[model samples]
Target chain A: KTAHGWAARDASGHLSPYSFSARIQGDADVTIKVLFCGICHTDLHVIKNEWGNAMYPVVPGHEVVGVVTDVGHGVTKFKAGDTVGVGYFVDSCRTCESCSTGHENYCPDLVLTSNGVDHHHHGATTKGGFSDVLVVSQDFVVRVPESLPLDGAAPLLCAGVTVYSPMAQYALNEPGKHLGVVGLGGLGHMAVKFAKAFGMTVTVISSSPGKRDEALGRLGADAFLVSHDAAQMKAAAATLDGIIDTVSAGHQIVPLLALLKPMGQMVVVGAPSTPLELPAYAIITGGKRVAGNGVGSVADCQAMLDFAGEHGVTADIEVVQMDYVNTAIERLEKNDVRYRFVIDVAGSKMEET
Target chain B: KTAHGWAARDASGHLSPYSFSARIQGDADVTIKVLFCGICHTDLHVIKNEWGNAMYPVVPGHEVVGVVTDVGHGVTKFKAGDTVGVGYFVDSCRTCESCSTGHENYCPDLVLTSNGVDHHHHGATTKGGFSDVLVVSQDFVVRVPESLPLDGAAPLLCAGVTVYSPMAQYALNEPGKHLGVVGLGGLGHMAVKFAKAFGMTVTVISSSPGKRDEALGRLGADAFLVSHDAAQMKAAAATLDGIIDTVSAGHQIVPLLALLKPMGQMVVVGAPSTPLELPAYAIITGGKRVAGNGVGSVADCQAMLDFAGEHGVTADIEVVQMDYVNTAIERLEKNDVRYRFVIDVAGSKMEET
Candidate 1:
């Protein structure tokens, strides 16, 4: 079958019309008509070959929401016309301990949604939701709630679950527990919403003091902290029970670690290009912990979606068309979007040159 | 009462005979006659003002094993002539959350057994067991089992509990678990013993290939890996359930982080002078953790002592008299001791020194 999508042909990362062959649906595959795809930092990195592993033309989109147009005989989880979602991964080795334990995201042989090799599909390059359609295994598909707006719910697949997983795992979601959400970008905004929904007191920490109003008023955070303000940081020392750091820029984490109470947790979700400077005394004196989290497990994604459905949680997103995605990517590079940019895949003219 | 001890009067850190007034015993006090004292890395740091917070005339020794010579009216935990031990801290604000929750070691107002101010004793600088006698609160003293030799048990109060507390907290002590011990010094050797005693497989990772025999033969480790050898480290990648990193020197931890299984833990017990370079991707992919531990709580000290007593776990020590203390300190700086250097306080002539 023919699939039309915008792809980056080189390191220029400029997306143009590209047509590719879609694989024949497997026994456990669910064929999806891509409706909406959330633009992620990882997508930007891959399209630009910033990570040095680009299989061009790279069609980049992982946080995808679509309609199940077709299902194979072995696909019992999804049916035709059902709203579904796909996250960072498309498939994994089923026998690994990570897979057996429902943490396929950390599997050694994990297949990314875009620019990854599909071992089960004749060594073909796997395309993503930037295309008109995606054929994913039923095991990797999640159901989108009817209450959620598809464009807004798209980022929930990756950005939402990324923060939600660690919060749930580290017990940061417990009612009345204080949580610190660093950066006011896509992942941080989602963290604030979920933490608020979980009855936690959320404090937003940002390097920009101007974001204080937006963080406290628009985002419903209980408090706002400018990261560089010594007095502010010093006053709030040892107050937070947990922190979800979402800034990808290189920054000092010693102060952030100091914000935590004794034995408090700091989960790093952002991938800063440079190494983080972690002094031994920062955590030793307080018995504090620092953990790294990629994305959530399949089960964790489902649980997050279910909880989000119940709590009416969704990302603050700006919807865009396929032709305007390049401009959106440029804007995203400068952080011009309100929170996230969701490519309206179904409404775009992907077949055009 | 006048007490005589060896004290460092300045940054030269040369110990000389010094006499200080000992506070009168209070209702909850237990006066102990010092027997054995373990020299820790912290003692060296303070005596030399390496951390820049040392009080002059610092009497440095927190890992103290002593006999209770007298107990005040309210001291029921200790009786006259009973063997007792004192660890890193002596007192903390009992009303704080950390103190209330049995983590007095993390309390901000914690009073160290050496060079710390004691609010209960008219703001006098609290002295350690380098002195001939120590007056400590009953709540701060732990019972030392008679089954273990006093000099060998001295390090258990500091080095022993430092590793044991984290293992027990992270469930790294579970039978059949695999633990990697980095750096085969005082803390590393103790980690191996406790991990083996808990029925876990132990692997010692050291930069020095020469210590492999000592790690495997004397410490009873299951395997040894030269950390700098890429082939050895790569082969054992993702094999550890937890790691106790006891190296104080600046070194790369990216390879060490690779040794952990998904969601595995790495506890940093040693305080390196320089900061550790932690690349976000090192821990983000596998959801690994890095924690810092100073020392255990009073309860943790008691529990570790009890476990050590049952398992016959004690540090390999080179016990010396008071006159040889300066030589021991010089040797310790060169890492020339077998594992630990313990001072026989009772057998030494402190009044002459």
Candidate 2:
């Protein structure tokens, strides 16, 4: 089957029109016509070979929202015309403990959506939803709620579950708990929304003091903290029960750790190029914890989407045409978008350069 | 009452004979005749003012084992001649959430057993077990089991509970679980023992390759890994269910974090002077956690002692006379002792020094 998408042929990461053969639908496959795909930091990293593992020509998109065009004979979960979503992974070794226990995202043999070798498909390179269509296993696809607009809910597949999983795992979702969301970007914004929906007191901590009003008034946060202001930080010391750090840029975490009460949790969701300076004394004094979280599991994604549907939660996104993806990526690198950038896949010309 | 002990007058940290007035026993006080005191790294740090919060004339020893000499009328927990132990803390504000929840060690107003101000005792400077006698609140004292030798049991009050508390709290004490114990010193050895008692597989990770025989042969560890050996570390990656890091010296934690399975817990009980370089990618890939712990609460101390008593768990110690105190401190600084240095305080001539 023929598929068309924008692909980066080299480290320059310049996107151009590319046509490729799609894998034949397997017994348990769900063929999706890509509708809206959100641009993620991971997409930028892989397309540019920032992590040194790029298999070009790479078509990068994981936060995918689409309509199911076909379902294989063995597929019972979804039917044609149903709204669906595909996240960071496409398949995992079902025999591993992580996969068997419903944490397939952490599985060693987990296959990524883009630039990953699919052993089950004759060692073919798996493409992503930046294309016109996708053939994914039914087990890995999630139902997209009708309540959320396709473009606004696109980032939920990746950004939403990345924060929601840890919040649920660490019990930070409990009502009346205090949560701090650092960096008001894609992941950070979703964290604020989900935390608020869970009835938590949300505080936004950012180096940019300008985001204060928007974070508190627009995002429904209860507090705003300027990271560079020592007096403000000191005044709010030991105030938070937990924190979700979403900044990919290097920053000192000592002050952030100080905001937590005894045994408070700080979950790191962003991958900073530089190492975080963690002084043992900071965590030792209060019995505090620092944990790293990747994206969530399939079950977690489903649950997050269900909850988001009930709470009317969706990403604050800027919808763009497929031709504007490169510009959006550049803007995303400079953090110029409101919260996220969702490429209008179905509405754009995939066949044009 | 007059009390005699060896005290450091300044940062020179040289111990000399000193006499001070002891606080009068209060309604809930228990007077203990100090017998054996274990020399911890904390004692060394305080005596030298390394932490900068040390009060002058510091008599450092919080790992205390003694016989109950007297009890105030309101105290019913211990009678004279009962074996007892005092850990890292002696008093905490009873009204704090931490105290109400039985985690008094994290209480903001908690008073250390050594070099802390006692607000209830006319604002007297608190002293530790290097002294001839101690008058502590009955609630702060734990009953030592008669089955264990006092000198070997001394470190249990501080080093024992420090590791045991986190192991219990994180559910790492379950049978068949794999635990990696970093550093083979005071706290590390105890972690191995407690993990072994729980029927978990214990592996000792140390930079000192020569300690392999002792760690495996004497401590009964299931395996040993020299941290600098990349091949060894790589082979054992993602094998541990939890890790208790007891190294006070600065070292890279990336490899250590790699040793954990997904969602594995690493508890840091030792405070390295330099900050640990934590690359966010290291933890995010596997959903690993790093936590810091001080000593355990009074309830945790009692539970640990009870478990230790039943399992016959005790620290490996080199018992020295009171006159050998200075040499012990010097040797301890070089990590020359087998594992721990315990002072026979009762047998020493406190009146002379």
Write one digit per residue (lDDT tens) for candidate 1, span A1-353. 55768899999899987777778798999999999999978899999999899999899999999999999998899999999999998999889999998888888888989998887776678888898899999999999999898999999999899999898899998798999999999888999999999999999999999999999898989999999999999999999999999999999999999999999999999988899999999999999999998788888899999999999999999999898998999999998988999999988877641
Alpha carbon lDDT at A118, candidate 2: 88
CAPRI classification of candidate 2: incorrect
Model 1 global lDDT (CA atoms, 0 to 1): 0.91
Each candidate's interface RMSD: 42.6, 42.4
- Which regions in candidate 1 have their CA more than 4 angstroms from the true location? B1-353
DockQ of each: 0.00, 0.00
True C-alpha contacts between chains kept, each model in order: 0.00, 0.00
In candidate 2, what are the lDDT values of residues A54-74, reduced to their tens digit?
998899999999999899999
lDDT of each: 0.91, 0.90
- True lDDT of residue B70, candidate 2: 88
